Design a protein around this ligand. Structure first.
Ligand SMILES: [Mg+2]
Lengths: 94, 59, 148, 55, 140, 108, 156
């Protein structure tokens, strides 16, 4: 008898939903966290002119390491030991 | 105790008869307690397959 | 699947840890081949680590048969009559050593579903719960709606 | 003996007589049995708790 | 017919040995047995989450039963046991409720004492002793 | 004085805190059921099988109890006696009868 | 601040008066003394403990077995002291930690009895109409511990 037109939660006529106490309290506590975040993002420490180049050396070194890893690429070494010890497959009593 | 095992089991899983009174009580508040003690949800030994239900006599 | 397999409870063999611990492994019997690529790990295990294993635990009797076989094997026999057979076919020496150490570590009980991983024989000390625990008494034991 | 009750290795026959003579040895007068608890008497599944009282 | 399959029976048995306890034609016929065994193994894998959840629910029910036997409520008991710094989980709490009723009564009494102390604290802001089963122990 | 829980059932609980304050001590001896709270065991001695002529006529009369019922009334009687439902007492097929474990695992 | 008695004038719950702190401190002292003298005389038998071990809490007593789901790097037959005891109870008394009891108070011993693996556990993944089917078999390591003794010391 209580019939909603097709696909309850989409369309022109939808099944109504209402907000409980849970949802309001959850929203309020997340808003409180956000407000405290706003507070703590309000007092910087280096005013954007004092941070001009304080990490440039370290970032350059990091990218140099990245490039060294990217360019140190080559086929691995090949040894006589593996080719010769494949002969151990037929090692009988000795 | 030390309760030889068969008497111990019988005592643990024995059925209890409870008396509950109507006389101006709300039927649903009576039914809540009746359902609890008919299912056996009032015993720390409760399980669904243990058949640990009790008798409720509502007058 | 548990519903498609047997089950048992956690248990010991003869109350192993109560008095003295005893090694439940009784015998290890090895079938290894003189020739044959599959018995090479077993061959080197017998060459090096079988003697040290026997010296390490002397409650276990180890036999090595050295017969022509396509599949080398180890048979573990336990004090409770349990027999377990394992294939050491085409296994490395470290694999075989781990296998034999595991065999010496286990007991003879079946490796099936264990069903409640604890076994207490005295589950209650203050008395098991019954519907009359936590229930007060009445004068003269008078049940509800009584007269005398 | 672990996990076994005393009367699973002794296998006594008359516990009341044994207790009576033990109390006679210990100079304890007599145990009288009283119904301490009960739940259902007219049903096929009764529960009785009987307590023994000495003096 | 160069190299046709010879050991198909052993693969059929590999699937069929997990269907022996089924009912109907799916305990013997591979075409239906394979589907039902696939579903059974998926159920076996998914059932671990439900086993954990259901065992925790059983512990909660048993603890609620015992606490109501002692007159307490489950949230009050759990919260005040946390506040007394006694960190027993639902499993061992139900274990004690079934097998150590004296210990469980002592635990419920301690939780009720802590709850009353919390009420007195909410009334009087400490002033002086802030309760005795309060006073958490500090660690460094 | 003050008690968190009533000390008349199952325990006499006292809660203490050590001087160091790091451990809680719970003392809880058992409470006995007092004699005034018990009733005497009944002693029924029914003897009405003695007629003035014989003495083994009552021994014969002792084996006079026998009764047979069909499935319907028997199941109704069992259900009434054990406060169960009728479905408990109908039989099961051979499949269910033979797929039941007759040697189940034993704990304790 | 006076209100005539009604159904809402006063809270439904009873009014609770907690005991006075100094007399309660003396009462706690005497209760701890009584429990300690019971311990020194040996008025206990067959006590149990709750032990935190391998991310789990175990209700152990003497003589029983515990199965823990990983290796321990111990030989079979090795005796071990099980620390992290948070409850120990005998008949008529119980000791609680906040959250752990002291080292000097309790001493739980356990011997390693069996090192094994579990039965095979099937891990099957399936999605319909997607050709999505995967299967694993896992056997986790396992250790069996036999609890030998739970001792208590008068240092209360
Ligand atoms: Mg629709």
């Amino acid at each position: 008898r209580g019939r909603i037109p097709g696909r309850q939660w989409i369309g022109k006529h939808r099944r109504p939903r209402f907000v409980s106490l849970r949802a309001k309290q959850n929203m309020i506590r997340r808003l409180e966290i956000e407000a405290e975040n706003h507070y703590w993002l309000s007092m910087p420490y280096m005013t954007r002119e004092q941070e001009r180049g304080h990490a440039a050396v370290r970032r350059r070194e990091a990218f140099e390491a990245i490039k060294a890893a990217a360019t140190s690429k080559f086929p691995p070494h090949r040894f006589i030991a593996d080719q010769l010890d494949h002969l151990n497959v037929t090692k009988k009593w000795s | 105790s030390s309760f030889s095992r068969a008497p111990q089991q019988w005592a643990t899983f024995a059925r209890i008869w409870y008396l509950l009174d109507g006389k101006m009580q709300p039927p649903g508040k009576l039914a809540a307690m009746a359902s609890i003690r008919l299912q056996g949800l009032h015993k720390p030994v409760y399980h669904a397959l243990s058949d640990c239900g009790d008798h409720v006599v509502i007058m | 699947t548990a519903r498609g397999t047997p089950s048992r409870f956690l248990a010991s063999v003869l109350h192993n840890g109560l008095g003295r611990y005893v090694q439940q492994l009784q015998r290890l019997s090895f079938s290894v081949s003189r020739d044959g690529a599959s018995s090479r790990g077993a061959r080197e295990f017998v060459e090096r680590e079988v003697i040290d294993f026997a010296r390490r635990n002397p409650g276990v009797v180890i036999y090595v048969n050295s017969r022509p076989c396509c599949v080398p094997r180890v048979v573990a026999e336990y004090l409770n009559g349990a027999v377990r057979e394992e294939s050491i076919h085409c296994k490395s020496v470290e694999e075989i050593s781990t296998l034999v150490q595991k065999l010496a570590d286990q007991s003879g009980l079946d490796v099936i579903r264990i069903r409640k991983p604890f076994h207490t024989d005295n589950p209650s000390i203050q008395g098991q719960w019954h519907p009359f625990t936590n229930k007060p008494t009445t004068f003269r034991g008078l049940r509800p709606r009584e007269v005398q | 003996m672990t996990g076994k009750e005393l009367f699973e290795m002794w296998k006594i026959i008359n516990p009341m007589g044994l207790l009576v003579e033990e109390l006679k040895k210990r100079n304890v007068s007599a145990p009288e049995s009283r119904l301490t608890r009960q739940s259902g008497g007219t049903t096929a599944l009764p529960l009785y708790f009987v307590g023994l009282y000495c003096d | 017919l160069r190299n046709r399959v010879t050991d198909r029976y052993f693969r059929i048995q590999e699937v069929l040995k997990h269907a022996r306890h089924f009912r109907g034609r799916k305990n013997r016929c591979y075409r239906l047995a394979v589907r039902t065994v696939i579903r059974a193994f998926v159920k076996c894998t998914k059932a671990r989450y439900l086993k954990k959840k259901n065992m925790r629910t059983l512990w909660i029910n048993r603890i609620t039963a015992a606490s109501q036997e002692h007159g307490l409520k489950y949230p009050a008991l759990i919260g005040n046991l946390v506040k007394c710094q006694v960190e027993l989980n639902r499993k061992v709490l139900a274990d004690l409720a079934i097998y150590e009723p004296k210990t469980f009564k002592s635990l419920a009494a301690l939780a009720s004492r802590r709850r009353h102390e919390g009420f007195a604290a909410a009334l009087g802001d400490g002033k002086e002793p802030e309760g005795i089963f309060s006073r958490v122990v500090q660690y460094h | 004085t003050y008690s968190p829980l009533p000390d008349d059932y199952n325990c006499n609980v006292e809660l203490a805190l050590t001087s160091d304050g790091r451990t809680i001590v719970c003392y809880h001896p058992s409470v006995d059921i007092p004699y005034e709270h018990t009733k005497p065991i009944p002693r029924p001695d029914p003897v009405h099988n003695n007629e003035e002529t014989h003495d083994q006529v009552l021994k014969t009369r002792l084996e006079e109890k026998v009764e047979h019922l069909e499935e319907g009334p028997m199941i109704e009687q069992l259900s009434k006696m054990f406060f169960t439902t009728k479905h408990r007492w109908y039989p099961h097929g051979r499949y269910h009868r033979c797929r039941k474990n007759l040697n189940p695992p034993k704990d304790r | 601040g006076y209100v005539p008695k009604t159904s809402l004038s006063s809270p439904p719950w009873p009014e609770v008066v907690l005991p006075d702190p100094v007399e309660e401190t003396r009462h706690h002292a005497e209760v701890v003394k009584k429990v300690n003298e019971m311990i020194v005389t040996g008025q206990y038998g067959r006590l149990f403990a709750v032990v935190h071990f391998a991310s789990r809490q175990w209700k152990v007593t003497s003589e029983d077995l515990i199965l823990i789901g990983n290796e321990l790097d111990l030989a079979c037959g090795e005796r071990i002291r099980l620390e992290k005891v948070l409850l120990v109870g005998a008949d008529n008394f119980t000791l609680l930690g906040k959250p752990l009891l002291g080292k000097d108070l309790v001493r739980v011993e356990a011997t390693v009895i069996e090192k094994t693996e579990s039965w095979p556990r099937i891990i099957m993944r399936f999605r319909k109409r997607k050709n999505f089917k995967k299967k694993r078999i896992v056997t986790t390591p396992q250790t069996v511990l036999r609890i030998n003794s739970i001792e208590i010391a008068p240092c209360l």
